[PDB]
Every structure is written in C-alpha cells, then in structure tokens.
C-alpha cells in the first residue's frame, strides 16, 4: 500500500519482520562467517524477543513504529480484538446492494406494501433489468443494455416496473433489538428521496419519524424470496412472539378517530332518528346525523 | 429539595425553579445513554450463551 506513489511504507509485523529479516539475515550471518556459540550470546536473546514481537509484542517489552508511541500489532494481534480477524468478519461483511435509507410517513399503501424512492431502485434491479433487456431483446449486447440504461430509457422504467411487481424486499431499522426490527413487504416505487412506511410495522421498527435510516435487502435466490415472503414478510408477524400479544398494535391517531366514531354528547341533531344503517353514511356525511349523536336506533344484522 | 414549584406549562416557571428543574432532565439523558450499552452487553452475553 504505497502512500505517495514512490514508497510502499509497509507497517507492523512485516516491518517487524524487517527487523526480523535482519535476524533472519543475522541467522544466516550466524550460519556462516560468525561464531554462533560466541554470537548467539546476545544475538539469540534479541532473536527470541523479536520473534515474540513479530508473533506477539504485547507479552513483553514495547515495539513502536516511527514517530508513533503506540505499540506494534503482531501476527496474533490482527486475529483477535475489535480490529482483528475475529472482529466483525464472521457475518460483519459489507452488503452488495443496500444502504442508508430515508424514513417518512407512508400514509397510503395498506399493510401489504412498502414504499421506496426510485433512485436507489433499479440500481438494485440492474441485474434483473439487464436480464429483462436481454430476455426481451431490448439489448442483445450487455454493452447495449449498459448504454440503454445509462440513457435512462422509459422503456427500461416499464421493464423495471414489470420486474418490481413480483419481487418482495426486506427492510430493517438501525439498532436491531427484537425480531421485529426487520420485515418483508411488496416494494412499490415512489417519486421522492425517502422510504414510505405504513403504520403497520412502525413501533416494531422502533424508529420515531425523525432523522433516521432504514435498510433494504434484495432476495436474490428464489429460496430467499420464498422465505422472506414466508417468514420475513410483515403480513405474518401479527402477534408478538414473546408476550404473545399482537405485534401489530394500532397505536396511532386512528384510535382517536375510532373513538370519535363511538360517542354521544347528549342528544345531537336527529337524536331520535331510527333507520336501517346503509344510508347512515348519507345521514352523517351529507346531513342529519353525527358520530357524536345519541339515540340512533338501527336494525343490526 | 425543600421548595417545590407551583407552576404550569401555561403558567411558566421561575428562574431558580427552572434551574432546579434541570438536574432531572440531565440525569435522565445520562441514564438512557449509559443504560443502552449495558443492556446490549447483557443481551450479547445471553445470546452467546444461546
């Protein structure tokens, strides 16, 4: 990893190996043209110390790099720790197609849906878009598809929408705490720069309509899609797995609205009205009745 | 503390009243912050155990 173009500027154990290479040379220098019995008197001790420092310097002594008081990270050092091989390397990988969503209200889109800004969309479907372009013959050449997509064709938009129909997606919030953090839903394109979310998975997402991010996941394998629509699909996590109570607990102002439905002040306009019910929508919306009205008798089926 | 505050969100607050009224909010902020991490550590330990 050269820095300025000229000098490689290698670091750490190889750099330590540099000094060890001295010893490695010195061993050869001890091998011939030096008296190993007379030499290893002070040589072998520094040899053991440096071999340690290359394998592990933290055990004894202090090996610092140029102009930095920090110690040396030896062979085992990059195996453990928060910055080692045992760091977030087993399942800590950076994903291929996801990242850094924007969150806002999905007032529309009854529960089985999820709204996403289209800009990131079809950057995801790029493999699917190319597959469609070749399969539909819109680009016999891969470079032809590259040009056509780079041209931002509306036919490509139609193709993407056709693909975006039958392919669900996965979404999750920032700090995973429950199994409720990630759900799966039908993706719907929306003209904006943020995600649209129904009040369906809101509390489970544990965010709060504020500066926040979400994560989108694309089921590539068919098994992935089948499982996500089967298990990750939000349209199945009805009841909370732990308490047993409903996971989907309506807690927004819709409660206030239903409350305003079933109330009666004392006796409103047409208090004594009695009817069948089907045109009560007229008697309320047009005129005659209020949700806050009492004594409205009705034949209930 | 000795003196309580007889005040409302529609009545305002006094200067020293507000000043006293600050320690609790500061403490709650600090508590939420320092508690998220400990909860996470315990959860991680349990999950490893599972």
């Amino acid at each position: 990893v050269p820095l300025d173009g000229g000098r490689f500027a290698t670091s750490d154990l190889n750099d330590l190996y540099r000094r060890v290479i001295n010893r490695n040379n010195r061993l050869k220098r001890l091998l011939d043209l030096a008296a190993p019995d007379i030499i290893v008197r002070n040589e072998k001790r520094m040899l053991q110390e440096a071999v340690d420092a290359l394998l592990d310097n933290g055990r004894r002594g202090r090996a610092i790099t140029g102009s930095n008081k920090r110690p040396l990270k030896s062979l085992a050092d990059m195996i453990k720790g928060k910055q080692g091989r045992f760091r977030q390397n087993l399942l800590g990988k950076r994903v291929d197609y996801s990242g850094r969503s924007v969150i806002t209200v999905g007032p529309y889109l009854r529960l089985h849906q999820c709204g996403l800004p289209k800009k990131m969309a079809l950057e995801l479907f790029k493999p699917f878009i190319y597959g469609k372009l070749e399969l539909r013959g819109l680009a016999t050449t891969i470079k032809a598809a590259k040009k056509m997509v780079e041209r931002e064709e509306a036919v490509v938009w139609d193709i993407l929408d056709e693909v975006i129909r039958e392919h669900p997606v996965l979404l999750n919030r920032a700090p995973t705490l429950h199994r409720l953090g990630i759900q799966a839903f039908e993706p719907v394109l929306i003209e904006g720069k943020a995600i649209q979310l129904h009040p369906l998975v809101c509390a489970a997402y544990n965010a709060d309509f504020d500066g926040d991010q979400m994560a989108v996941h694309v089921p590539l394998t068919l098994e992935a899609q089948l499982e996500a629509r089967a298990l990750m699909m939000s349209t199945n996590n009805i009841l909370s797995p732990a308490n047993g109570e409903p996971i989907i607990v309506p807690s927004q102002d819709v409660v206030l609205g239903l409350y305003y439905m079933t109330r009666d002040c004392v006796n409103a306009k047409g208090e004594g009205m009695v009817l069948t019910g089907p045109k009560e929508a007229e008697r309320l919306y047009r005129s005659g009745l209020a949700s806050l009205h009492a004594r409205v008798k009705v034949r209930i089926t | 503390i000795e003196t309580p505050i007889t005040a409302n969100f529609r009545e305002g607050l006094n200067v020293l009243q507000y000043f006293i009224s600050t320690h609790g909010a500061r403490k709650g902020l600090a508590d939420t912050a320092l508690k998220t991490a400990n909860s996470g550590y315990l959860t991680r330990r349990l999950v490893d155990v599972a």
Partner: protein, 1341 residues
C-alpha cells in the same frame, strides 16, 4: 430616544417588563483578552512571554564567564493579509525577533565583561496573531482553540471514601495538585494510618519524608503531639490535670481534685464535675498507676548515670520499667494525651511501622521506590528528593497556586513560591489528621470555588516556555563549549524547534479545531465553548458520572441546557450571557449589590467563594421607585437553599433575568412555557441551520439578534463613517466627514465585502450591501447584510404559515405537511459552494502539465477546457467532466516498429503522455463559481492565469487610484485657490492644469515659492503612488510556494442550489423535530374562510407528550403578527395617508403592558416613518424575553386589536372534499429552520462494487460508492428468522467472495439463482495467521 441609525429602519416589538440596566457583554472578549495580553507590552513581566522568556532568558556558560541575555523583542508586521493569506493559504501570522546579547567575560576578573555581541536581533520563530474576530488563520484555515477548564493548583483534603473503601470505613485523604512538579498525596488507610503517595505509586510511609526532611522523630512528635508533664516524684503518681484540657471520661478510681474528690471512683464525667474542677485550682493530683501503664513515654529519656536506651520513644510505659525509670532516669517523664474520643496519634502509630529511622536511609528508600534499580551513591537519592519538591526549577507550581494553598492554610499572606516548604506540609498533615479526628470539611468537586478556566494566552505561553526550556540546554552547551569566541548570540539560534512547537500546539491539538460555519449564532457559540477534555480535567471519555451534574455554585456560570446529546453531555458548558472571568483562573458573575432596601445599580462580578456569603435576590422581584422592595419576604439565596428573606435580609441583586441563560440558549423565545428536555434538544438543534436564498427575518425572537450579529462579525460595522460615498455590488466606499476625518487621511473607507466565499462548513456565505446610495450613517453602522441576516438580525430560517390538525395519516407522529406552495415560491432553497483541485508534479517519467492534450479522448470533453486546460468561469458541469487536465509523460519507447508505425501514422502522442487529468465528481454537479491557482516559484506557466492575475491587478490598481485621485483633487484645488485673486481666470486653469500658468507671478514673492513647494509635493506624490503601485504589483506576482514537488496546484470551486423535497429535515424554535414529508397538490391544502391557505399542516397529536406549550404560544403570536402586517399592507394598498398610517402604527406599538419607550410622530420624519412602514411589509417583528416573555393576556387582547380571535379558533375548509370543518382550530405562522442533515447525503445505493486487496470486502461509507457493514445483533436476528438461505447468501454473496462473485453475477445474468459456498478466504487467512504465529495450521477432513 433609540436613534439606532441602522435599526431606525425597523423597530421590533419588544415585550420586556423589567427596566434594563446592563448591556450584553462584548460577547467575544473571552476568546480575545487572553491572546491580547499574551503579547501585551507590560512594564512588569507578569505573564505570558514577558514571563516565559524572562523565566529562562539568561543562558550561562559552565563557568565560561559567557552569558546570553536579551534587551527586548518585537513582532514583525504581516506578510500576506488576512483575506490575502486566505487566498494564498499560508498561516497568517507575524515573526518575532529579540535583540540578543552574547557577552564574553574574561577570567581572573570578578564578572569582568570583555566583549559584547549585544547587537544581534534574534528571530526565534513567528507569533500567530489572534484575529479581530479572534479566529485562528492556521495554515490559512478557519479554526479556533477551545478554552481550558481544570482544577485549581493547591492543597485539598479530599474525602475519597464510601463504597470504594470496601470496609465500611470513611477515608480521610488529601491531594496537592501543583501547576508543575510532582503530585503529593496523604491518604488514610483502613488502619487509621497515613500513607504518602507520589504520582499514584505504591504507598510510602507517612513518616518517611519527615525523617528524610531533617526532622527527628523527637521533633516530629513534639510538634505533632501534646506532651503531658506527668510529674510523679517520689512515686507520687501525681499529674497536673486540667479539666479544660482533658475531660469527658468516666473517672475509674483514685480520682481526687485538690483534696476533696470532685470526680468519684467509677463516676461518669459530668459537666458539673468538669466545671467544679476548673473553678477550683487543680494541682498535681494522685492518679492510679493503671493510667501510667496505658500512658506512653513521650520523650526518650536516659538514666542519669548511663545513657542507656531504656524507655524508648513511642513505647507504652511499663510498671516494671516504670520503677527502673523513676529510680534511675528521673521522676517526671513526658507522656501524651492522644484523647481517642477527640484526637488520635495515628502517626506514632505510623512511627512504629516506619522501617527506617535515619535521614539517609529514608532518602535511599525514596530512590528505591522512584528508581526500581540503580541504588544511589549518597548523592543520587538526596538529589532526587531535593529536586522533587524542594527545587525551584522542578515544581514551582504557581503564585495563584500559592494563594490557593495559603488560603487552604488560612495563611494571612497568599503570595508564596511555587516550590514546596516544610511548615506548609506540617500544617497540611495537621489539618488532615484534625479532620480525620474531625476539625473541618472535605472539599467539593462540584464546587465552583475549586475549578478554574485557563485561557488561550496562558496555553500559548506554556508552549513557548516549554520550547525555551528545551532550547536553553543547547544554549548553555554552546556557551560553555568553545566559550573562547566573540560570536553574536546566533551561534546556535535555531527557530525551527520553537516554530514547530508553536505550530503543533496551534495546528495539531485536540483542544483546537476548525470553526463552525453553520450560521452566525453557531459561530458566536462554538468559539465561546468551554470543555474540560484535553490537557486537563478528565483523562478518558469514561471516569465520571457526577462530573456532569448541575453544580449549586454554577447557577451563574454556564447556561444550564446548552450541551450536546451525544456521549460527552454535561461536559460542554457555554459562557453565560454575561460570564466574566476572575483574576487568577476562575469565572465570576456581575450582580447588583443590595444595600438598605434600595438595590444599587452598581454591579460587581462575584465568585463562588463570594457567592455563598451574601444574600442575593431573585430576578422576578419588584423594586420600588425608591429602589426599595415590594414584598418584604422575597425569595433570595444565602448559602444555596433559596428561601424568603426580609427586605433588610438581602445583600445583592442580579443583573438581568437572562443572567442564567447564555447565547446558545437565549435565542428561543416563549421559554417559560417550554419543557426542559425538549428545550435542550431544540436548542442543540438550533445552531444546526443554514442561511436561505431569501433571508426571511425572524418575526418573534428574543430581542438579541441585533447584537448577536453585531459582535459576531459576519457583517460590517461602519468604523468612523459619516455618509455613503460609493455603493457597489462588490464593495462600498464611504467618505468620512471632516469632523471625524483624520488629518492627512483619505477620509474615505472601502469595505470590499467578498461574495460567494466558501466558509468552513461548505456553506455559501455572501455578504450583501445594506445601503443603496448616499445613505448617511454614523459610526459602527450595520453596513453588510450577512449570511442568514436581514438588516442586522440572526435571520436563521423561514417564517411559514401553519395550522394545527392531524389528517389522513400523512401527519402520523412527527411529520410536517408542506404542500406545493412552498415548492412554488421555493422559499428555503439551499445554497452551497464546494471546491476541488489538482497538482502538476513534475515527475521522473515526465512532468504532468495542464495542456488539455488528452490522447484517445472524446472531443466534447475538451469543449469546456482552455489552452491552459482550465475551464472558463461561468460554465455548467455535470457527471465526470474533466476539470484540470495534466498529462503525465511515461517511459520512452525504443525504435519499436509497431510503435514506430503508430507514431508515423497518428503520432504526437505515442502513448507518451498518460492521462493525468482531473474530472468532476460522480454524483456532484454544479456551476463553477470561482477559481484560483498557486505554482511553485520559478514555474511561469500562467496560461489562463495571467488573465486572473490581470483581473486582480486591475482591481488593486483601481483601488489605489481612488485615494490618489482624491489627493490630486485636493492639491489641484489648493493650487487653483492660490491662483485666485491673482488675475488668473478659472477658465484658464480649467482649460488645462498648466501648473496654473507655471507660477505666473500673481504675487511673485511667495506665489512662486508656494508654487515650487506645491509642485514638489505633486511630484513626490506621483513618485509615492508609483512606488506603492510597484510594491503592490511585486506582491501580486510575488510567487507561490508548492512544497510537495508540484509545479502548480490549481483549485476550482463550483456552486449548487438544492430544492427542499419530501422527507427532508426541519424543526422549530419551540423545540420540535420533524420532516416535511407530504407533497400535496395545491388544490389540497385547506384554505381559510377568506380563502388564504396554509402550506404546513402539523401533526398535532404530539402536543402533550413533550409539554410543547411554546409551540402554541408561537402559533398565537404568529397569527397576530401576520395579521398586523397584512393590515398594514392593506392600508398601503389604498395608498393611505401618512398621518393615518402613523396613528395606526402608533396605536399598534402602544398596546400591552409596559416594556419600552418609543413614540412616533415625534422623531421619525414622514419619509422616515414611511421608510419604517415600507420595511414592515410582512408583519411586526416581535421581541419576547425568555425569562420575561409577554403575557398571553396581552396577546389575546391584541388579537381583538388585530380583529382576530383571541381564542384563535377559526373555521376550516377541506380542500379535498369541500366540507366545512368541525373543531374550529387556532392557526398561525410559525418559524421553521432547515437543519444541516439534508438529504444531500441521505440517499445511497449500490449494485456491484470492488473487493479489497485484503479481506476482499466492500468499500464503506459512500467512499467510492461504498457500502455499510451488517450488524452482529442483526446476524443474531437473522438466525432468529431461521432464514438459512438469507444468512448463507449474506455471508457468501454480500461478503468477500471473488470467484463466487463472478459465478453469481454470471448466474444472475443467466437467471440461474445459485450460490457456491466453497470456503471463505478469511478462513484460510486465519489458518495462515495461526501458521504465521507459532502453531501449524492443519484441518482434518
């Protein structure tokens, strides 16, 4: 009579009940006075450099009789100017040179000076001057150094007890914190034994130092312990006992008081018994020998005949040894009191535990503890001990530290040496042991009498003194070595280390950082912050929970709320709205002393030690016209528990009702109805906003924004100006009236504000000019319209109309519903200016030069380039458009028949030049605003640069020309007036100068002489102007410096505007976060009964859960003010008369309770009144104090005066279905600010990226279309799904797979949908790492 020549244009409506006394502080004096003093010429060397150099000024030869001293130093004038250096990019600073003196004195003569080299001025470094804005110009860059807040130097008796003891024992420790030298601690162990500690090492004996400190155990005990005579002569067992001295103990037996026994045997000590024993004279009374056995021999006594070691000190008396001592030694033997109820030896207890008894042995233990090995040679241990604290050049803590320690000893004098002293440590141990037995109180960490704020001048002084210390060693080394020389004191004067130290302190230090440019308020705040992190205070982000609490003495130090919500909360205090600084290191608070009922207007700064003394009355307290009090029992504070006190029980009064709220908080009005936690969130967000394209002045603020921009210095004040001379969209020229015009001065000022300056936070600051033409203005007048400012206010945000109702789920919890209207007028459009650059870098394979010669390139790219390769100013840019095109030549080719034919056919490239071109960023597009370039001196490319150079020269020459013309006009007028009354008609001298006929002889006696003098003046002026032009020209092309081997570095800065779209971030000054998230077609947003819609429909259900009454107060105030403005504009629509509109506004500014004095029709002229009207064309600006806001009563009343609903409820019409709306709602206008975290980084995607060289993973945080890394908790969640395919692909497809990546990409192309597990490369890598360390890696099958 508030003249306010700047603010007479517009007078905001105040609501301040209390009568103001003291103005706001200079509001930048803290970040200025320290550096101002740091180079202040002081007649006595008291601090800073006058102390730092005077500390180690004399450098002496090692008895070489050669000395080095300095008479004085002076700092040089600047090289590049502030903006000029900013363009250049160097650290704007000033060199300093000291007249040095190398004096060699001859031997064999008493201090006999032989030669002096006191003729060399030594410039050892350059001083970085602090700005008039107090901003660093380090490397050109905008930056500031955060102040220091640490613990004072002294001695304190800390408690350090509780659960840490792990034994249920209260520890009585003590620590001395010196400003330099070693740290000493005297702790009390669980065995009630003192332990000495130095620099937190293993505990040392308590008495080890005293024995080492030339103090015998006899002297130590005699000073420490009270010795009883115990005069038992002839076996009398009689002691002289004082019931006053020792009492309170039940008399066991043989207790008699001067004959008659006052204390019975087995009788408990009574106050009557002690009183009787004191009333009658008590002589040596007989006591049981049991008290002797318990008693210890205080003094070490030897027998009269032999000096035997019988009865050693610190030994309890033994009855068998008692007879031996009484018969042989003496009859009276010293014993001690050690009254365990009230006292305790605890040192004689430590005296027995002492391992060594000799001073030399004690010195050797000290060396053994300090130095683990290398035992001393009777000189090393002693030297180390003497230098530890008894040295002048090692501890020398502080004279202020001396005052603190002396006060801790309650010493009459507070002036002492920073070095240690014996009696001081003695008194320290005395106080510590007394408190252990109980004599006083331990100190308090949260106490403000213990913390001190160190300012920037002291820090720089510390760095400078540190550098001088390192230099003095080599100085003395060179003075001693080869002292037989008469060289100037520059033999080894190297400024490189001093400069490096000063820079590193200023440049790379966590205590400093680049400044906040978000808005004027954010800049006025960050530069005034106070945090304890860094070289002092807390060492780690951990280690504290009570460190961040609200100190009881902190009521007048920081604003209580303003601190971030991140990890470091409670550790970032803000200078109070009037926070003053103490003499030594602390901060006081001005307050009005209350004397005899009336409250004196005189205010003095008071400190925490002073603060707990007097009685101070609360702000919301009435004061009689006599100054007296209204209510006799008034809530006042005496010692931290405020309570009602009598009108004669008060001693002080505060300054202002805001004296507890600082600037970072003072801005938000309607404070009293604002909840605490939400207020903190809102104010910490408040500095997070960006100036808008249209500066919508803040309608209802807190009255401060005028000054908040005035002292902030993002606008221009009219320094000594009387009227406007020239006004321009690039500068302003003002002619100074002769009254204030300096003699021999131009009497003209040119403020050349710079538009489109890319400030610190990548925002777009473009100062705008206030006046139009010939505006008469007095001194300091607001002349420049700054970013997010409007005629002098902190114009941070847009005043948008809104209405309170939830609707259709689009306003679920915290959403804002901006319809298409605010899209149309595009208010709150974002501005930005962002830069880039390239380098030339003459290389080995061949220099890369900007020639626009790109081989194998598309022509359209070059369509925007110049022959220089630059792009002309004013072009458009999208995609990866080439920006700065260098061509790096490559290795030459041989004859190369294929390449020979290629050069023969096409030629001119031969692939010799490889593309070293710069291109526009991917996903960043804009329009090129402005450019610059700096080439290493000696490189004279200047292809498209000589044009820019010429432009700069033209501007400079034009600037120089004006003063020259003015002076020439003055001289020509003087000459022509001299020709007056001489028969020379003005038509002649008007036709041509002609030297006024070249002294025609109008008087011919002095007219010739005066003409000669004037011609001399004219020629001299011509020469001087030419010289100035030449100097400026040479400066213009003085040559740029490109240290990094680049022939030239050229920067191009482009512009951008951003459109507020769904999902972006906004908030309110009443503390509420939210996102504008619903784009409703304009046929949707409900319309008023008069038809006027509102563009913001706020989610209302959140009203309770945060006690955001302030939002409602805002709604009401905004409705009323928008109504007042609309009515005034409507009056204007009929072109109403001046008198009528004047009366209307006079009644408008007269409603409500008593706040301010201002009356129309008495001061403002009709056009001036007309002007005030015309500016007040969208409302009435409102000033509601935070702690003294206006009553909602006056608001609701003025609503009737505004013919508006005092309740505010109003009819609504649903734009979607056209139904008259139930629940008449109160709607109004509220301010809203756009915060930094705009969408411009929110959206992010990726499809296929590159693998790393190691671990083959994706990039990261949008770095080269980077991608974030998944979470281990998320992985556990994925397991909880049991989605084996999902986790498998995530660990395979979304991981380091290369050969699996290609196979999967091919399958996705082919629609196969298959992933191949194989084995991760990281697995083999870890196997190798095992094999890399001392273990074979072998995996079985």
């Amino acid at each position: 009579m508030v003249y306010s020549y700047t603010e007479k244009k517009r007078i905001r409506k105040d609501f301040g009940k209390r009568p103001q006394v003291l103005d706001v502080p200079y509001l930048l004096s803290i970040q200025l006075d320290s550096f101002q003093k740091f180079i202040e010429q002081d007649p006595e060397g008291q601090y800073g450099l006058e102390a730092a150099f005077r500390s180690v000024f004399p450098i002496q030869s090692y008895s070489g009789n050669s000395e080095l001293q300095y008479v004085s130093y002076r700092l040089g004038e600047p090289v590049f100017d502030v903006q000029e250096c900013q363009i250049r990019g160097v650290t704007y600073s000033a060199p300093l040179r000291v007249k040095l003196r190398l004096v060699i004195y001859e031997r064999e003569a008493p201090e006999g000076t032989v030669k002096d080299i006191k003729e060399q001025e030594v410039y050892m470094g350059e001083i970085p001057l602090m700005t008039d804005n107090g901003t660093f110009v380090i490397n050109g860059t905008e930056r500031v150094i955060v102040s220091q807040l640490h613990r004072s130097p002294g001695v304190f008796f800390d408690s350090d007890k509780g659960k840490t003891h792990s034994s249920g024992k209260v520890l009585y420790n003590a620590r001395i914190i010196p400003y330099r030298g070693s740290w000493l601690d005297f702790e009390f162990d669980p065995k009630d034994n003192l332990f000495v500690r130095i620099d937190r090492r293993r505990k040392l004996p308590a008495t080890i130092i005293l024995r080492a400190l030339n103090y015998t155990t006899e002297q130590i005990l005699d000073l420490f312990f009270e010795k009883v005579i115990f005069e038992i002569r002839d076996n009398k067992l009689q002691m002289e006992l004082v019931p006053e001295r020792l009492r309170g103990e039940t008399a066991s037996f043989d207790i008699e008081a001067n004959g008659k026994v006052y204390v019975e045997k087995g009788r408990r000590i009574t106050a009557r018994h002690i009183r009787q024993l004191e009333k009658d004279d008590v002589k040596l009374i007989e006591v049981p020998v049991e008290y002797i056995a318990g008693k210890v021999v205080a003094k070490d006594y030897i027998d009269e005949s032999t000096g035997e070691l019988i009865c050693a000190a610190n030994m309890e008396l033994s009855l068998d040894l008692l007879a031996k001592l009484s018969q042989s030694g003496h009859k009276r033997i010293e014993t001690l009191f050690t009254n365990d109820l009230d006292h305790g030896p605890y040192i004689s207890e430590t005296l027995r535990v002492d391992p060594t008894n000799d001073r030399l042995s004690a010195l050797v233990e000290i060396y053994r503890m300090m130095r683990p090995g290398e035992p001393p040679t009777r000189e090393a241990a002693e030297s180390l001990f003497e230098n530890l604290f008894f040295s002048e050049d090692r501890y020398d803590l502080s004279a202020v530290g001396r005052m603190k320690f002396n006060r801790s000893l309650l010493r009459e004098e507070i002036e002492g040496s920073g070095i240690l002293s014996k009696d001081d440590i003695i008194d320290v141990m005395k106080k510590l042991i007394d408190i252990r037995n109980g004599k006083g109180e331990v100190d308090d960490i949260d106490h403000l009498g213990n913390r001190r704020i160190r300012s920037v001048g002291e820090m720089a002084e510390n760095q400078f003194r540190v550098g001088l210390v390192r230099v003095e060693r080599a100085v003395k080394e060179r003075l001693s070595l080869g002292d037989l020389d008469t060289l100037m004191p520059q033999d080894m004067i190297n400024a490189k280390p001093i400069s490096a130290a000063v820079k590193e302190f200023f440049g790379s230090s966590q205590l400093s950082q680049f400044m906040d440019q978000n808005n004027p308020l954010s800049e006025i705040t960050h530069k005034r912050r106070i945090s304890a992190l860094g070289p002092g205070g807390l060492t780690r982000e951990r280690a504290g929970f009570e460190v961040r609490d609200v100190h009881p003495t902190h009521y007048g130090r920081v604003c209580p709320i303003e601190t971030p919500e991140g990890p470091n909360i409670g550790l970032i205090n803000s200078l109070s709205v009037y926070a003053q600084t103490n003499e030594y290191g602390f901060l006081e608070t001005p307050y009005r002393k209350v004397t005899d009922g009336v409250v004196t207007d005189e205010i003095h700064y008071l400190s925490a030690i002073e603060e707990g003394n007097y009685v101070i009355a609360q702000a919301n307290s009435n004061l009689d016209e006599e100054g007296h009090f209204v209510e006799d029992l008034v809530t006042c504070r005496s010692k931290g528990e405020s309570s009602l006190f009598s009108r004669d029980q008060v001693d002080y009064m505060d300054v202002s009702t805001q004296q507890v709220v600082s600037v970072g908080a003072s801005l938000i009005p309607f404070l009293e109805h604002d909840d605490a936690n939400r207020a903190l969130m809102g104010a910490n967000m408040q500095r997070q906003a960006v100036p808008t394209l249209r500066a919508d002045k803040p309608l209802v603020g807190t009255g401060m924004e005028r000054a908040v921009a005035v002292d902030s210095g993002v606008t221009a004040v009219a320094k000594r100006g009387g009227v406007v001379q020239y006004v321009d969209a690039s500068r302003i020229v003002i002619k100074v009236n002769e009254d204030e015009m300096y003699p021999g001065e131009a009497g003209i000022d040119i403020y050349n504000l710079t538009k489109y300056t890319r400030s610190n936070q990548n925002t777009c600051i473009n100062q705008m000019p206030c006046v139009s033409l010939g505006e008469p203005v007095e001194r300091g007048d607001v002349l420049a319209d700054g970013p997010s400012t409007d005629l002098g206010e902190l114009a941070l945000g847009q005043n948008m109309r809104v209405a309170f109702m939830p609707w259709n789920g689009y306003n679920f919890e915290d959403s804002i519903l901006v319809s298409e209207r605010v899209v149309q007028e595009d208010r709150f459009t974002t501005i930005h200016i962002q830069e880039l650059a390239c380098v030339s870098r003459d290389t080995k394979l061949g220099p890369e030069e900007i020639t626009a010669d790109i081989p194998n390139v598309g022509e359209a790219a070059l369509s925007k380039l110049d022959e220089s390769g630059i792009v002309y100013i004013g072009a458009e840019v999208t995609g990866g458009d080439i920006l700065v095109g260098k061509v790096t030549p490559k290795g030459e080719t041989q004859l190369t028949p294929e390449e020979k034919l290629l050069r023969a056919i096409f030629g001119e490239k031969a692939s010799d030049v490889k593309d070293s071109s710069l291109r526009v960023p991917n996903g960043v597009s804009g329009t090129v605003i402005d450019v610059q370039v700096f080439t290493r001196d000696g490189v004279e490319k200047d292809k498209r640069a000589l044009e820019i150079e010429e432009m700069q020269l033209k501007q400079a020459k034009k600037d120089l020309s004006e003063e020259l013309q003015i002076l020439e006009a003055g001289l020509f007028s003087r000459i022509r007036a001299v020709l007056v009354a001489g028969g020379v008609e003005a038509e002649k001298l008007d036709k041509l100068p002609r030297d006024r006929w070249l002294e025609l002889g109008l008087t011919d006696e002095e007219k010739q002489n005066q003409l000669e003098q004037l011609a001399e003046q004219y020629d001299e002026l011509k020469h001087e102007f030419e010289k100035k032009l030449e100097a400026k020209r040479r400066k213009i092309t003085q040559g740029d410096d490109l240290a990094p081997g680049v022939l030239k570095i050229v920067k191009v800065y482009l512009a951008v505007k951003r459109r507020i779209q769904p999902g972006d971030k906004m908030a309110g000054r009443h503390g509420n976060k939210g996102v504008i998230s619903k784009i409703n077609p304009i046929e949707d947003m409900p319309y008023d009964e008069n038809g006027t819609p509102v563009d913001i429909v706020l989610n209302p259900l959140g009203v309770p859960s945060r006690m955001n009454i302030g939002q409602i107060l805002e709604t009401h105030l905004g409705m009323a003010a928008k109504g007042i403005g609309d009515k005034i504009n409507a009056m204007l629509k009929q072109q109403q008369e001046v008198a009528k509109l004047r009366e209307f506004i006079q009644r408008a500014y007269d409603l409500g309770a008593d706040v301010r004095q201002k009356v129309d029709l008495s001061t403002f002229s009709d056009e001036e009144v007309m002007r005030l009207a015309e500016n007040l064309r969208k409302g009435m600006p409102i000033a509601t104090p935070v702690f003294d806001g206006a009553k909602e009563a006056e608001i609701k009343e003025l609503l009737k005066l505004g013919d508006l609903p005092t309740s505010g409820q109003i009819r609504l019409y649903d734009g979607r279905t056209g139904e008259q709306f139930e629940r008449p709602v109160t709607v109004g206008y509220m301010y809203m600010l756009k915060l930094n975290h705009l969408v411009d980084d929110k959206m992010h995607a990726r499809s296929t990226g590159s693998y790393s060289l190691v671990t083959q993973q994706p990039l990261g945080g949008k770095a080269q279309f980077g991608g974030q890394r998944f979470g281990e908790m998320e992985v556990w969640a994925l397991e909880a799904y049991g989605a084996a395919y999902t986790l498998q692909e995530m660990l395979t497809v979304k991981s380091d797979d290369v050969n699996g990546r290609t196979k999967m990409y091919k399958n996705i192309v082919d629609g196969n949908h298959q992933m191949e597990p194989g084995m991760p490369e990281s697995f083999n890598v870890l196997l190798k790492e095992i094999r890399s360390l001392g273990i074979n890696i072998e995996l079985e099958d």
